[PDB]
Design a binder for this molecule. Structure first.
Ligand SMILES: NCCNC(=O)Nc1ccccc1
Ligand SMILES: NCCNC(=O)Nc1ccccc1
Ligand SMILES: NCCNC(=O)Nc1ccccc1
Lengths: 348, 348, 348, 348, 348
């Protein structure tokens, strides 16, 4: 017994859609949903999606309010659709997937993922919901997340962090570390050995190791000195060269976090989505140095050190593929006389 | 248990709102309501009101599908609101009135007209609906329409025609002639002795008397000759002078209907509504004669003849008030040497 | 090398998309596409779809400009998508189908119909285009139209009429009669023995038989007298009873065409689309008789006569299914004492 | 003392802007202007321009309500701007020109055409307004229209017809024939000896000569027989060949008017504007013959006869330039053995 | 070979328009540009201008990504248009100028500034681009910026700061100090002796002299004591009187910066543009003192001290013109008994 008036009632009284019965009066003026809160109109939802205002209002209200895998993780694992839930893409103010299953009649391609329409698309299954583990076992294609062990299935320990209502966090009061399982054409998969991006902010960056505390506390030539990083171009790649017209290096988030405490800079996110490697148009406000496409990746500093140290420095330029967030991230490794000139994530 | 999905279901399955239960999936794109009719979107309603698309969609679907008094008649009788119905302005694609009573939660000022909010408003009562005659008796202000007699209430036989879903007709299968009753401050006000406009189109004009058949068939100087209309300026007022830069006279619809069979002309309705006197920006396409404000009124030709003949032709210019459609329409009667120079509905 | 500027160039110089190279300057204001035609903006396309203005502009410009099966025929044959073409719904100003194949990158689900995404969808194949007959043979699901014979494939002679740029016509300079072929699950399905709706207008109705000329020329009780239609309720079903508040019968377009010459009436098409049975909210402007859902079907008069005469008139009410336009149209046949009380296309 | 409320007051009380003082309350909902006409909103103007709703509302209200040269004539004479008036494009619901002079502050580039900004623009001068003849004499570039003689200035008798509020007419009550004068770089340019298009409609076409009455009344092979048009392909060019898939010829409006009485056809005006040669996407509804770009020009039949007969028929294909409406319209004259194969307005 | 799909491709892959070939699929939904980044739509640009979404998307992507003079500087120097570049007005989310030269076909008035259309408008020339110095020499009117010396031309050292992608900075990695050259009607100009506004933020204000460090560090009556500012009303003008209903003085940004560390206040920028003197509706959140138009100018404290000290204090009120940012800023100097009562930038 779904309706715009019942969906808005749930937003008004339960904070989101809770299946409760009741209706509040709604008015729609363009791409914005309002409700008469005694006399005057109070805005419940502003549509920022490509979907019709009422269809997207419902999807937003029927979003998952539990910690779910980050959109980048789901996209890297070829997830197409979610089973009986809406993964809200909080960085895009839109539903993460094209269609739904058993959620909104207007976006729904199926009511249950058992239907032939779902057979070819990798349906996401939340093992924390009743019966979704068995739905994954019978599903032709899928991605399952579980909190604990699944009999028979070989687990793949995912990232420590998950998204709770847009907030990317490492849960303490809730579990955010999941077991990943992927299936392709009925065959259970052996997920790759992978690294995970730390998914941190520039404003609230916090070091997650002793190397990260030493990088943020110690001066440039003494962090490298302590960690034997001579000839790995950390001064260029991680610290960033702000001396010339084009901003040099600055590809690890920890370097942007360190440059931030001292001086600010503009990061223009021209493709605002969730990806393992993010591209920014940076302008360092102090020096005036700038770059149009500056690929910034947030790896744990020890992980980037372990990646660059596990490399061959003989050729001038080669493509270094690294499995990060279940995806093959290509990097361009530039060299000269046994040392790194630059090592940035490849612009593909 | 009202909702956009239940209103749209009723539009799809009953042609309008019929109180039936059920829901169809709806999408709102700007000011237009669509429903997925197997695979693709079919438009159910295009919003042309100043109300939000969904609020107006509901009002339109909950419109009166029975013959109701023409909007001009309701406007002349100082009607402000309708009791438990929506009177639709098919001339402007919008509800004839600002607020509702027991229809739409978003426009509703009351559920029943007995409430104190309705006391100073002239609520329209349809005596054809159960209990609306008594609601008129207790209502402080109102306008009642009945098919037959109401005990004690002095009747006022209204126009032969009524609006059935936009179609202004003289009913045969239904009753379009009503009894009018008005009350102001709790006192039943006596309705004036009035004329009624024939509410006809220019494309489908049809004469409604022998004088009207003689006017549309005979030549100019022989219609006047037969009906002794010498000295009343019917050549200017009713026939229309298309000889100078400014179009002369042409104020009776029957004259526009006669000029239409021979030659076309552009009538720019710059204030699109239903009024007893309509103002048009006319451009006669044959001669090129034109007028910016040309007040055109559709009275029965015999009625205009009976109005002008009964007028005193001694003074040069006087204001002639005539009760038409329950409103006092002022006219400017111009004269010279015992004859009418011009007689037009006065520009206030 | 597709672009909004190349699509608009083709609209400006070729009348539609013709694959020609070149670009005209375009501006987009809301849901409307304009081109600067020396100094000022001339409107090339007004978006009436639920697709983005530029995505729909391209689909409209890349429409099929050859006679194609009417949208109702394609909808009755379960057609979901078109192979490398856009079938335009001129009745709703929008593409007849949700997605495209090898036409627009933004709507495209595939470049060629051979792809696994097209396997469960009924792809429409135009046998008049090179290689589309073989594509139908290999396609898991499809609907093929051919001008002549296809070896092995059992033909189904479709309607005489087809849609040429919105114009439903019976071609003389072009072939509008096609051979239909349908396949489901990789199996060529036998098309039913069917009737075809004449797809005519109310304004320009033209009789297509001697019975139709006799119906439009003769009086009521002498058309029935000549065609021995005693006891079949043609006075109610085909002629229409305009005597009571609710309009009786009037379910054959030929009856609406005959009532039209004498008097006008309002037909509110509340679900604007192309269907075998159309539902209208009729208001006869002369009598005032009206119906909310009046199912009107345009069969050839001889076909409706042949359908009703062959029916058994013993039971009071039975569901009469008739195959019209490849769909099983249900009808409710009401009877009493060996004669038809009413026989209308059943309201599901 | 200009304002949206004063402009709307003038629209409401004078039919257009008349410089009168006063203000009515206005509301703007999207691209539409409304005024509260007692209780409810009545629409005064729907914006169809690329200008802001209020800026265009004012331009429309301050339009020229006198007969002015047709937009095509002004466009052919290189007119860029109007002096202290707004020439309205009733064919596109927008001001014919980009900027204004002494009309709207928001579009105004100058208050008077004497200003240096107007010097390289061809300002249109209406000699019927006080002082505009002298403004033309001092204006570096301009186009002047006068009713009578201007001393020293060599006249160019323009078309018999002019546009009066969208209505293209040959004035009787007003003068529609003007004297044209053009100046370029401060030098009075001699206007060419030209033909004029008759500017007629397909619905209300009326012959304007004995040849045109004979063409619309007589059969094909006897109109040509009477007017000695053997060997000029009037059967193809003017009559139109509806026998093959592509519609042949049909380039004179009189041929479309003659084909119209018998059978209808769809003319898709894909570039909606006023031009000497119009391009249409025609689909003959009877035969099914069609053309994507069918250049249709409305010349007087005698004028087209006089153009084609005077042409040399020796070469296979040559470009025939003809001065029509002050513009050199190119035509492609195709020939074989002393006769015309085709003669159409050339597709540039 | 320009197009919406090529412009968006460049935004997606190069961070801005870089002339690279390629096309990404785009959808336009109202005033917002999106691109399908695998499955779902990612927003590339939200239109905040008065230009059509696609025309303004292109201008934004084709913006100058090098340090250019601040919009206020260009407006003060009468710059009308830019030569073969787009100066983005980052404070207005729009292109700084009406038209373009050799950038966007839809805004372009010329391809090269040598054209007669550019002769009367002051074209901005960037001497850092090849051949723009010579274009300035031949240009009738222009404003040239060079990094170094131009033979013959007398330089005018502009501000230390320039705008790099919205970021107003004093370049270290790039040059931001330019040489200004202006030309009027072919005559090279002697630019005025001028002051420059420091163009600083309230959040990140940084002192740029010893007087500014003493003002931000020292208490009120000891800064004045040290700098002999007795009788110059710095307590009112620069410090600000927050004791009465109307906020007194507070006209120098350094005073707003000092009041900010202690307590916050609301600055309503009701005309959000870049001007030498900015007008704000201030409300001091601590005291409740407020002003509707509070003219705030960011001069270096030593410059304001040198301006007020270089004044005559005899008359009660006079207009003090000061050349700041190449424009004549008027100030109202109020006095009594040989001292300043107030000295604020004049409200013109
Ligand atoms: N002829 C005037 C018709 N227009 C309206 O009736 N507009 C309206 C309706 C409801 C609320 C506000 C305005
Ligand atoms: N009679 C229905 C026609 N309407 C449509 O066909 N709408 C549409 C087209 C493409 C994508 C989504 C909706
Ligand atoms: N047939 C073209 C008519 N369209 C316009 O004239 N558009 C317009 C008007 C004023 C400013 C910008 C565009």
């Amino acid at each position: 017994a779904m309706s715009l008036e019942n969906v808005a009632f749930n937003v008004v009284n339960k904070g989101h859609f809770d299946g409760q019965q009741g209706e509040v009066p709604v008015s729609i003026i363009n791409n914005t949903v309002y409700t008469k809160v005694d006399g005057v109109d109070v805005e419940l939802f502003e549509n920022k999606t490509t979907l019709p205002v009422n269809v997207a209002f419902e999807l937003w209200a029927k979003r998952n309010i539990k910690p779910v895998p980050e959109v980048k993780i789901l996209n890297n694992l070829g997830v197409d659709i979610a089973a009986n839930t809406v993964i809200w893409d909080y960085k895009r103010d839109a539903p993460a997937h094209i269609s739904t299953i058993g959620v909104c009649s207007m976006t729904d391609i199926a009511k249950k993922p058992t239907e032939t329409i779902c057979a070819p698309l990798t349906v996401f299954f939340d093992g924390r919901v009743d019966g979704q583990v068995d739905l994954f076992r019978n599903a032709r294609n899928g991605v399952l997340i579980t909190e604990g062990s699944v009999k028979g299935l070989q687990p793949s320990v995912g990232p420590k962090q998950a998204s709770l209502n847009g907030v990317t966090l490492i849960g303490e009061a809730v579990k955010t570390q999941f077991n990943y399982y992927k299936k392709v054409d009925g065959v259970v998969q052996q997920l790759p050995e992978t690294y995970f991006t730390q998914s941190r902010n520039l404003q609230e960056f916090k070091p997650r190791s002793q190397m990260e505390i030493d990088f943020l506390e110690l001066a440039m030539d003494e962090f490298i000195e302590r960690y034997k990083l001579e000839g790995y171009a950390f001064e260029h790649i991680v610290y960033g060269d702000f001396s010339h017209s084009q901003l040099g290096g600055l590809h690890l988030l920890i370097g942007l976090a360190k440059r931030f405490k001292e001086s600010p800079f503009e990061l223009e996110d021209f493709i605002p989505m969730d990806s393992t490697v993010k591209n920014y148009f940076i302008t360092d406000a102090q020096t005036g140095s700038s770059k149009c496409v500056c690929s910034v990746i947030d790896l744990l500093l020890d992980d980037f050190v372990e990646i660059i140290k596990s490399q061959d420095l003989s050729v001038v330029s080669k493509v270094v593929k690294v499995t990060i967030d279940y995806t093959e991230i290509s990097f361009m490794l530039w060299c000269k006389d046994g040392h790194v000139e630059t090592f940035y994530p490849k612009l593909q």
